[PDB]
Coordinates of C-alpha atoms and ligand atoms in Angstrom, one line a residue:
Chain A
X1017 CA 7.5 -75.5 -62.6
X1018 CA 4.4 -73.2 -62.5
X1019 CA 2.4 -76.2 -61.0
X1020 CA 4.7 -76.0 -57.9
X1021 CA 4.2 -72.3 -57.8
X1022 CA 0.4 -72.7 -58.0
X1023 CA 0.5 -75.2 -55.1
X1024 CA 1.8 -72.5 -52.7
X1025 CA 0.5 -69.3 -54.2
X1026 CA -3.1 -68.8 -53.3
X1027 CA -3.4 -71.1 -50.2
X1028 CA -0.7 -69.1 -48.5
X1029 CA -2.3 -65.7 -49.0
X1030 CA -5.6 -67.4 -48.0
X1031 CA -4.4 -67.2 -44.4
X1032 CA -4.1 -63.4 -44.3
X1033 CA -7.6 -62.4 -45.2
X1034 CA -7.5 -62.7 -49.0
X1035 CA -9.7 -65.6 -50.0
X1036 CA -9.7 -64.8 -53.7
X1037 CA -13.5 -64.5 -53.8
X1038 CA -13.7 -64.2 -57.6
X1039 CA -12.0 -67.7 -57.9
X1040 CA -13.8 -69.6 -55.1
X1041 CA -16.6 -70.9 -57.4
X1042 CA -16.9 -69.0 -60.7
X1043 CA -20.0 -69.6 -62.8
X1044 CA -19.4 -72.0 -65.7
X1045 CA -21.2 -74.4 -68.0
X1046 CA -23.9 -71.8 -68.7
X1047 CA -24.5 -68.8 -71.0
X1048 CA -24.4 -65.3 -69.4
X1056 CA -21.2 -65.2 -74.0
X1057 CA -20.7 -68.9 -73.6
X1058 CA -18.8 -69.9 -70.4
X1059 CA -16.3 -72.7 -70.6
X1060 CA -17.7 -76.1 -69.4
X1061 CA -17.6 -77.2 -65.8
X1062 CA -14.5 -79.2 -64.7
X1063 CA -15.4 -82.5 -63.2
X1064 CA -15.4 -82.4 -59.4
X1065 CA -14.9 -78.6 -59.3
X1066 CA -17.5 -78.4 -56.6
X1067 CA -15.1 -80.1 -54.2
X1068 CA -12.7 -77.1 -54.3
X1069 CA -14.9 -74.8 -52.3
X1070 CA -15.7 -77.5 -49.8
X1071 CA -12.0 -78.4 -49.1
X1072 CA -11.4 -74.6 -49.2
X1073 CA -13.9 -74.3 -46.4
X1074 CA -12.2 -77.1 -44.4
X1075 CA -8.8 -75.7 -45.0
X1076 CA -9.7 -72.2 -44.1
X1077 CA -11.4 -73.4 -40.9
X1078 CA -8.5 -75.6 -39.8
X1079 CA -5.8 -73.1 -40.6
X1080 CA -7.3 -69.8 -39.5
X1081 CA -9.3 -71.0 -36.6
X1082 CA -7.4 -74.0 -35.2
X1083 CA -3.7 -73.5 -35.9
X1084 CA -3.4 -69.8 -35.4
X1085 CA -5.4 -69.9 -32.1
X1086 CA -3.3 -72.9 -31.0
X1087 CA -0.1 -70.9 -31.7
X1088 CA -1.7 -68.1 -29.6
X1089 CA -2.2 -70.6 -26.8
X1090 CA 1.4 -71.9 -27.2
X1091 CA 2.8 -68.4 -27.1
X1092 CA 0.6 -67.5 -24.1
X1093 CA 1.3 -70.5 -21.9
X1094 CA 5.1 -70.4 -22.4
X1095 CA 5.3 -66.6 -22.1
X1096 CA 6.3 -66.4 -18.4
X1097 CA 9.2 -68.9 -18.3
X1098 CA 10.6 -67.4 -21.6
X1099 CA 10.2 -63.9 -20.2
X1100 CA 12.1 -64.6 -17.0
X1101 CA 14.8 -66.6 -18.9
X1102 CA 15.2 -63.8 -21.4
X1103 CA 15.4 -61.1 -18.7
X1104 CA 18.1 -63.1 -16.9
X1105 CA 20.0 -63.9 -20.1
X1106 CA 19.9 -60.2 -21.1
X1107 CA 21.3 -59.2 -17.7
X1108 CA 24.0 -61.8 -18.2
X1109 CA 24.9 -60.5 -21.7
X1110 CA 25.2 -56.9 -20.5
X1111 CA 28.8 -57.9 -19.5
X1112 CA 29.6 -59.2 -23.0
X1113 CA 28.2 -56.0 -24.4
Chain B
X1017 CA -30.6 -76.3 -54.7
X1018 CA -28.8 -73.0 -55.4
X1019 CA -30.7 -71.5 -52.5
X1020 CA -29.0 -73.8 -50.0
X1021 CA -25.7 -73.0 -51.6
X1022 CA -26.4 -69.3 -51.3
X1023 CA -27.2 -69.8 -47.6
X1024 CA -23.6 -71.0 -46.9
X1025 CA -21.6 -69.3 -49.6
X1026 CA -20.9 -65.7 -48.7
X1027 CA -21.5 -65.8 -44.8
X1028 CA -18.8 -68.5 -44.5
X1029 CA -16.1 -66.5 -46.3
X1030 CA -17.2 -63.4 -44.4
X1031 CA -15.4 -64.8 -41.4
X1032 CA -12.0 -64.9 -43.1
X1033 CA -11.6 -61.2 -44.0
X1034 CA -13.7 -61.2 -47.2
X1035 CA -16.8 -59.1 -46.6
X1036 CA -17.8 -58.8 -50.3
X1037 CA -17.8 -55.0 -50.1
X1038 CA -19.4 -54.6 -53.6
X1039 CA -22.5 -56.5 -52.4
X1040 CA -23.0 -55.1 -48.9
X1041 CA -25.3 -52.3 -50.1
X1042 CA -25.2 -51.6 -53.8
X1043 CA -26.8 -48.5 -55.1
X1044 CA -30.3 -49.1 -56.6
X1045 CA -33.5 -47.4 -57.3
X1046 CA -31.7 -44.5 -58.9
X1047 CA -30.2 -43.4 -62.2
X1048 CA -26.4 -43.4 -62.5
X1056 CA -28.3 -46.2 -66.9
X1057 CA -31.3 -47.1 -64.8
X1058 CA -30.6 -49.3 -61.8
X1059 CA -33.1 -52.0 -60.8
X1060 CA -35.6 -51.0 -58.1
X1061 CA -34.9 -51.4 -54.4
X1062 CA -35.9 -54.6 -52.8
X1063 CA -38.2 -54.2 -49.8
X1064 CA -36.3 -54.4 -46.6
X1065 CA -32.9 -54.5 -48.3
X1066 CA -31.5 -52.1 -45.8
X1067 CA -31.9 -54.8 -43.1
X1068 CA -29.2 -56.9 -44.8
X1069 CA -26.2 -54.6 -43.9
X1070 CA -27.5 -54.2 -40.3
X1071 CA -27.8 -58.0 -39.7
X1072 CA -24.5 -58.3 -41.6
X1073 CA -23.0 -55.9 -39.0
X1074 CA -24.5 -57.9 -36.1
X1075 CA -23.4 -61.2 -37.6
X1076 CA -19.8 -60.1 -38.3
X1077 CA -19.5 -58.6 -34.8
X1078 CA -20.8 -61.7 -33.1
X1079 CA -18.8 -64.2 -35.2
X1080 CA -15.4 -62.5 -35.7
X1081 CA -15.2 -60.8 -32.3
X1082 CA -17.2 -63.0 -29.9
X1083 CA -16.9 -66.5 -31.0
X1084 CA -13.3 -66.6 -32.4
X1085 CA -12.0 -64.8 -29.2
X1086 CA -14.1 -67.2 -27.1
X1087 CA -12.5 -70.2 -28.8
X1088 CA -9.1 -68.5 -28.2
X1089 CA -10.0 -68.4 -24.5
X1090 CA -11.1 -72.0 -24.6
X1091 CA -7.9 -73.1 -26.3
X1092 CA -5.8 -71.1 -23.9
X1093 CA -7.4 -72.1 -20.6
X1094 CA -7.4 -75.8 -21.4
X1095 CA -3.9 -75.8 -22.9
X1096 CA -1.9 -76.9 -19.8
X1097 CA -3.9 -80.0 -18.9
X1098 CA -4.1 -81.1 -22.6
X1099 CA -0.4 -80.5 -23.0
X1100 CA 0.6 -82.6 -20.0
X1101 CA -1.9 -85.4 -21.0
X1102 CA -0.6 -85.4 -24.6
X1103 CA 3.1 -85.6 -23.4
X1104 CA 2.3 -88.5 -21.2
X1105 CA 0.2 -90.3 -23.8
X1106 CA 3.0 -89.8 -26.4
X1107 CA 5.5 -91.3 -23.9
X1108 CA 3.1 -94.2 -23.4
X1109 CA 2.6 -94.8 -27.2
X1110 CA 6.4 -94.9 -27.8
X1111 CA 6.2 -98.5 -26.8
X1112 CA 3.5 -99.3 -29.4
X1113 CA 5.5 -97.5 -32.0
Ligands
Y01_1201 C1 10.2 -76.5 -44.4 C2 9.8 -75.1 -44.0 C3 10.3 -74.8 -42.6 C4 10.3 -74.1 -45.0 C5 9.5 -74.0 -46.3 C6 10.4 -74.6 -47.5 C7 9.6 -74.9 -48.8 C8 8.1 -75.0 -48.6 C9 10.0 -73.9 -49.9 C10 11.5 -73.5 -49.9 C11 12.0 -73.5 -51.3 C12 10.7 -73.4 -52.1 C13 10.8 -73.5 -53.7 C14 11.8 -72.5 -54.3 C15 11.6 -72.3 -55.7 C16 10.5 -72.7 -56.4 C17 10.5 -72.5 -57.9 C18 9.2 -71.9 -58.4 O1 9.2 -71.9 -59.8 C19 8.4 -71.0 -60.5 O2 7.7 -70.2 -59.9 C20 8.6 -71.1 -61.9 C21 8.0 -69.9 -62.7 C22 6.6 -70.1 -63.2 O3 6.4 -70.8 -64.2 O4 5.7 -69.4 -62.6 C23 8.0 -72.7 -57.9 C24 8.0 -72.8 -56.3 C25 9.3 -73.5 -55.8 C26 9.4 -74.9 -56.2 C27 9.4 -73.3 -54.3 C28 8.3 -74.1 -53.5 C29 8.4 -74.0 -52.0 C30 9.7 -74.3 -51.4 C31 10.1 -75.8 -51.7
Y01_1202 C1 -20.1 -73.3 -39.8 C2 -18.8 -73.7 -40.6 C3 -17.7 -74.1 -39.7 C4 -19.2 -74.8 -41.6 C5 -20.2 -74.4 -42.7 C6 -19.7 -74.1 -44.1 C7 -19.8 -75.2 -45.1 C8 -20.7 -76.3 -44.7 C9 -20.1 -74.6 -46.5 C10 -19.4 -73.3 -46.8 C11 -19.0 -73.3 -48.2 C12 -19.9 -74.3 -48.8 C13 -19.6 -74.8 -50.3 C14 -19.6 -73.6 -51.2 C15 -19.8 -74.0 -52.7 C16 -20.1 -75.3 -53.1 C17 -20.1 -75.6 -54.6 C18 -21.4 -76.3 -54.9 O1 -21.2 -76.8 -56.3 C19 -21.9 -76.1 -57.3 O2 -22.5 -75.1 -57.1 C20 -21.6 -76.7 -58.6 C21 -20.8 -75.8 -59.5 C22 -21.4 -74.5 -59.9 O3 -22.6 -74.5 -60.1 O4 -20.7 -73.5 -60.1 C23 -21.6 -77.5 -54.1 C24 -21.7 -77.1 -52.6 C25 -20.4 -76.4 -52.1 C26 -19.2 -77.4 -52.1 C27 -20.7 -75.8 -50.7 C28 -20.8 -76.9 -49.6 C29 -21.0 -76.4 -48.2 C30 -19.9 -75.5 -47.8 C31 -18.5 -76.2 -47.7
Y01_1203 C1 -22.8 -80.2 -38.4 C2 -21.4 -79.7 -38.7 C3 -20.5 -80.2 -37.7 C4 -21.0 -80.0 -40.1 C5 -21.6 -79.2 -41.2 C6 -22.6 -80.0 -42.1 C7 -23.5 -79.2 -43.0 C8 -23.6 -77.7 -42.6 C9 -23.1 -79.4 -44.5 C10 -22.7 -80.9 -44.8 C11 -23.3 -81.3 -46.1 C12 -23.7 -80.0 -46.8 C13 -24.5 -80.0 -48.0 C14 -23.9 -80.8 -49.1 C15 -24.4 -80.5 -50.5 C16 -25.1 -79.5 -50.8 C17 -25.7 -79.3 -52.2 C18 -25.4 -77.9 -52.8 O1 -26.1 -77.9 -54.0 C19 -25.6 -77.0 -55.0 O2 -24.7 -76.2 -54.8 C20 -26.4 -77.1 -56.2 C21 -25.7 -76.4 -57.4 C22 -26.1 -75.0 -57.6 O3 -27.3 -74.8 -58.1 O4 -25.3 -74.1 -57.3 C23 -25.9 -76.9 -51.8 C24 -25.3 -77.0 -50.5 C25 -25.5 -78.4 -49.8 C26 -27.0 -78.6 -49.5 C27 -24.7 -78.5 -48.5 C28 -25.1 -77.6 -47.4 C29 -24.3 -77.7 -46.2 C30 -24.2 -79.1 -45.6 C31 -25.6 -79.6 -45.2

């Protein structure tokens, strides 16, 4: 079950300004002490990290900003009128 | 080819809240153990870092917020009508 935890753990905190910079692309397959060998296709992980961070943090958050902004006025008027209606129930 | 990787590595993650604070301006050219000597013009790197972070994070992201916001209504109406058209194809 730790695999399912590792699916959601670091990509979720990646949205809130913690990119885990020590684990983006650690040096491996060299001697600095002998490092463990390079996993195959481990260079893909920073690239899809870049695409994910771009899509999430720039596209979806700003789109939710636009959604919150362009539906603010109708929701504000409806909420004011509904609160004035629910004053009687209170 | 590691030079081309180093071009894109840290400035890209600099947008998402990871400024790499240990490598902004490390102490050098002193004894704390003898540090390696100061590179010439290494003080320029935090200044252009400051200008880059300002321009990127404050100018361009907020401008994309404005672009997403002011074209939201036309895109929303067009997308609703296009989805209602593509219901038949589905
Ligand atoms: C659909 C949207 C609106 C809500 C989000 C729901 C899911 C994305 C959440 C809710 C329940 C969550 C699960 C609740 C419990 C666990 C057990 C957890 O197990 C461990 O951590 C085992 C311990 C370990 O070995 O570390 C792994 C994550 C997981 C599957 C969670 C994965 C994410 C889930 C499916
Ligand atoms: C302006 C923005 C919207 C896009 C520009 C950013 C990307 C084009 C950059 C940022 C991070 C970069 C990646 C950072 C690290 C790597 C790992 C690198 O692989 C290795 O170095 C091998 C393994 C190792 O030596 O540790 C291959 C390039 C790649 C995928 C880079 C490809 C280009 C990326 C995706
Ligand atoms: C134009 C916009 C819309 C898209 C962005 C495209 C480029 C900015 C990307 C796409 C392909 C990328 C290249 C794909 C592969 C590599 C090899 C990579 O090589 C290594 O990492 C060598 C291993 C090492 O020594 O660390 C260095 C980055 C580089 C040149 C990447 C640099 C960034 C590039 C040019």
